[PDB]
Coordinates of C-alpha atoms in Angstrom, one line a residue:
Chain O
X1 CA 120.8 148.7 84.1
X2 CA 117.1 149.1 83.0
X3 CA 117.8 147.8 79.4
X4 CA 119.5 144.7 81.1
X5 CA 116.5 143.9 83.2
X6 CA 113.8 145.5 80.4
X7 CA 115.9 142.0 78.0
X8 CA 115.0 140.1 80.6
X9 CA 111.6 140.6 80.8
X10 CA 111.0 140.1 77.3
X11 CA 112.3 137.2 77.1
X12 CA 110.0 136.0 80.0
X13 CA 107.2 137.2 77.8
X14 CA 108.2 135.4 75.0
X15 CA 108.3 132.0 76.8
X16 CA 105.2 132.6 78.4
X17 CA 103.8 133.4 74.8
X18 CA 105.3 130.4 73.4
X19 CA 103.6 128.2 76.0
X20 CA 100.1 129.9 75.0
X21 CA 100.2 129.2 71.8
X22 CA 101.4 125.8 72.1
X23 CA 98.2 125.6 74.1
X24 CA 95.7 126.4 71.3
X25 CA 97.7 124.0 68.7
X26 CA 96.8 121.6 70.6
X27 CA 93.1 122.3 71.3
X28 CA 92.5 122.8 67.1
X29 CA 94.2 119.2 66.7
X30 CA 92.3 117.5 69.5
X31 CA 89.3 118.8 68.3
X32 CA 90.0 117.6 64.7
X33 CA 91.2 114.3 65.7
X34 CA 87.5 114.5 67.7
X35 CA 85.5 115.4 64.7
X36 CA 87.1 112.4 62.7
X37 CA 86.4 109.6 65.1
X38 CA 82.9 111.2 66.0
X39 CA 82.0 110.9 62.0
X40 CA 83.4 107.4 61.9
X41 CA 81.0 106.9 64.9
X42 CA 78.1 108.3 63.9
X43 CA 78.5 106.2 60.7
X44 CA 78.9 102.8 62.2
X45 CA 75.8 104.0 64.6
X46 CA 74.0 105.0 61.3
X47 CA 75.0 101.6 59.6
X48 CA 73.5 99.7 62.6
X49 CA 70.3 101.4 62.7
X50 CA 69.0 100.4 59.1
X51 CA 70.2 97.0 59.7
X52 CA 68.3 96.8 62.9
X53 CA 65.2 98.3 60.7
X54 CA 65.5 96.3 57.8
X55 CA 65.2 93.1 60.5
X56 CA 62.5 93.6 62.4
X57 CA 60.4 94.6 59.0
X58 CA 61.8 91.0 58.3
X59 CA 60.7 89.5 61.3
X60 CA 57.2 91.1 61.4
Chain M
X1 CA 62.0 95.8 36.1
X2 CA 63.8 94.9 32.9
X3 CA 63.5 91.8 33.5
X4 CA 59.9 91.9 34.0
X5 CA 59.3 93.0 30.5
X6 CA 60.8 90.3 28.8
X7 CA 60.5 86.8 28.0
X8 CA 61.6 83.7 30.6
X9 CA 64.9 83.5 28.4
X10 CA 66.4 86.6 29.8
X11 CA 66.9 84.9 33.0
X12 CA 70.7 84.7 32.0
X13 CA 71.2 88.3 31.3
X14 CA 69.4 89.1 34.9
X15 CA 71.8 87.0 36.4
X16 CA 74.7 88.5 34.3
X17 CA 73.7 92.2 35.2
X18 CA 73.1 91.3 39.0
X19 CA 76.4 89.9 39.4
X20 CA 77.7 93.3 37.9
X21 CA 76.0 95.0 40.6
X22 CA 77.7 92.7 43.1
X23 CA 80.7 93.4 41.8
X24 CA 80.1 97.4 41.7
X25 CA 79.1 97.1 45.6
X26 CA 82.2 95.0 46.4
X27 CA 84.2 97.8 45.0
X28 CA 82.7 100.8 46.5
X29 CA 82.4 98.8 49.8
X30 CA 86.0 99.3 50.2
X31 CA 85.4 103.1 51.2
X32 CA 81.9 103.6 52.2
X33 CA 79.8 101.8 54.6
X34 CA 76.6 100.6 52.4
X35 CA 73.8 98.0 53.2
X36 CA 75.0 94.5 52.4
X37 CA 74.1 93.4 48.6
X38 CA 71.6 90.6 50.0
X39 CA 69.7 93.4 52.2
X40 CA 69.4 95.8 48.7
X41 CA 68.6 92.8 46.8
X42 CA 65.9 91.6 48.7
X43 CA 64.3 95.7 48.9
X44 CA 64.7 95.6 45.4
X45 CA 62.9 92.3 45.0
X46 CA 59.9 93.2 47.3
X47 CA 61.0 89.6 48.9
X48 CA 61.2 91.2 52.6
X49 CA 58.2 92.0 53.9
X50 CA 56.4 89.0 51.9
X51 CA 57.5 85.8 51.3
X52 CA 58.1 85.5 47.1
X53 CA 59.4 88.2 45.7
X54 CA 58.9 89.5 42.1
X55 CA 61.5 87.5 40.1
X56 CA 59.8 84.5 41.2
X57 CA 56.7 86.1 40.5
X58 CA 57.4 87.0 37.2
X59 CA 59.2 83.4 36.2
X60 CA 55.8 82.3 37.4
X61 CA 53.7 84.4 35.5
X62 CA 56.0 83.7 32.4
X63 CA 55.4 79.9 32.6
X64 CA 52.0 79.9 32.8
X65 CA 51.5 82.9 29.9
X66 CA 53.9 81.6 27.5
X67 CA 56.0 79.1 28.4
X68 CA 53.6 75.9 28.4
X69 CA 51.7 77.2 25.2
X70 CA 54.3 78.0 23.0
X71 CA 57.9 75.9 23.2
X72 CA 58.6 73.0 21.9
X73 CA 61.1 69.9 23.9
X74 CA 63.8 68.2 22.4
X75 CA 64.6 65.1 23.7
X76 CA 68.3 64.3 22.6
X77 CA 70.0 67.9 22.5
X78 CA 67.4 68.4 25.9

């Protein structure tokens, strides 16, 4: 009867749901492991770049 | 700078007093990512872009000023 197939369809729903927001869970931690790595980056770059600076002033 | 306004027998307290600030760099080293302590040192000292730096200058200066004119050698205790 329509309540049989109306349960079944809502429970379609609800694993398609579930799927979604699995989705985005993993997009905000991928994009926070991101930022981490991109800091430690940028700092090693940073940490290079006045080395390189204070070396040539050295050398000059 | 401190050292600069004082006599040539605070040599040892410089020396004491740097090697505190080696010791504070060592220990924040272990979490942030700072110039290395000969890098700083040498900034501090004016002693990258010119050959002496101001220690030397001032150990100089010292000598010369008050050094040879006013201390008296000991032979035995040296």
């Amino acid at each position: 009867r329509e309540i049989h197939q109306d349960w079944a369809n809502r429970e379609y729903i609800e694993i398609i749901t579930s799927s979604i927001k699995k989705i985005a869970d993993f997009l905000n931690s991928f994009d926070m492991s991101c930022r981490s790595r991109l800091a430690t980056l940028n700092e090693k770059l940073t940490a290079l770049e006045r080395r390189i600076e204070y070396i040539e002033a050295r050398v000059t | 700078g401190r050292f600069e306004s004082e006599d040539l027998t605070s040599i040892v307290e410089l020396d004491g007093l740097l090697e505190i600030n080696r010791m504070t760099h060592k220990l924040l080293s272990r979490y942030l990512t700072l110039d290395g302590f000969d890098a700083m040192f040498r900034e501090a000292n004016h002693n990258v872009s010119a050959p002496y730096g101001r220690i030397t200058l001032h150990v100089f200066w010292e000598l010369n000023y008050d050094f040879l004119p006013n201390y008296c050698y000991n032979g035995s205790t040296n």
